[PDB]
Ligand binder design. Structure first.
Ligand SMILES: OC[C@H]1O[C@H](O[C@@H]2[C@H](O)[C@@H](O)[C@H](O)O[C@@H]2CO)[C@H](O)[C@@H](O)[C@H]1O
Length: 194
């Protein structure tokens, strides 16, 4: 695995929180299968006042088989498999987005990229992945109200390949930076299969 990438659109408007905000997302490889754990330092995000949301972003060649939340609850079956299932509406807590199923409109893969990682001032590398069409699934959880470190654990089967980008994104649905965009942070790592 590569070294950790972290970016955010957090700017001067957030005082001595700007850098804690930038570094809140981290990803660590754990183990024909890939397993990794995502940690969100929600400390300075004020989620308990007005909630946030998180995003898990998966590449081509990986298929989520298991996802466990910070309460060690297996929430895999909570996510839609059809993006147009009525259980996938904007109100719902667990949402799923897929490039195969659509790119544009509110539940479209590109729209959700734009509203998640796109907003986290992604470096050139993260943008290569999106632009090089190397990513295909987004898993989303609304209503994050925690104020501590949340850890999720994800397992996925390698369906195809050597390069495996893993991304995660957290943001506020209310607090914005100085250009009026939701404060949004990202962490990513490249896993290479030798
Ligand atoms: O990304 C998950 C959310 O998608 C929709 O909101 C998006 C976007 O994230 C938000 O920042 C923007 O203000 O509006 C978009 C839709 O018009 C849902 O509204 C959210 O509840 C989440 O599902």
């Amino acid at each position: 695995q590569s070294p950790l990438i972290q970016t955010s659109n957090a700017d001067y408007k957030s005082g001595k929180d700007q850098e804690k905000l930038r570094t809140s997302v981290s990803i660590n490889l754990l183990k024909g299968q890939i397993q990794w754990k995502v940690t969100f330092d929600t400390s300075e995000w004020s989620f308990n006042v007005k909630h946030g949301g998180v995003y898990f972003i998966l590449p081509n060649g990986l298929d989520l088989t298991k996802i466990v939340d910070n309460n060690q609850h297996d929430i895999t079956a909570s996510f839609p498999t059809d993006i147009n299932d009525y259980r996938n509406s904007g109100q719902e807590k667990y949402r799923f987005f897929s490039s195969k199923q659509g790119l544009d409109n509110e539940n479209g893969f590109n729209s959700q990229w734009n509203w998640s990682a796109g907003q986290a001032n992604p470096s050139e590398t993260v943008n290569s992945w999106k632009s090089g069409n190397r990513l295909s699934k987004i898993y989303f959880i609304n209503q994050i109200t925690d104020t501590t470190e949340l850890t999720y654990t994800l397992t996925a089967k390698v369906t195809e390949q050597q390069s495996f980008p893993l991304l995660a994104v957290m943001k506020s649905f209310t607090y914005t930076n100085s250009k009026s965009t939701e404060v949004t942070s990202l962490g990513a790592r490249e896993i290479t299969l030798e």
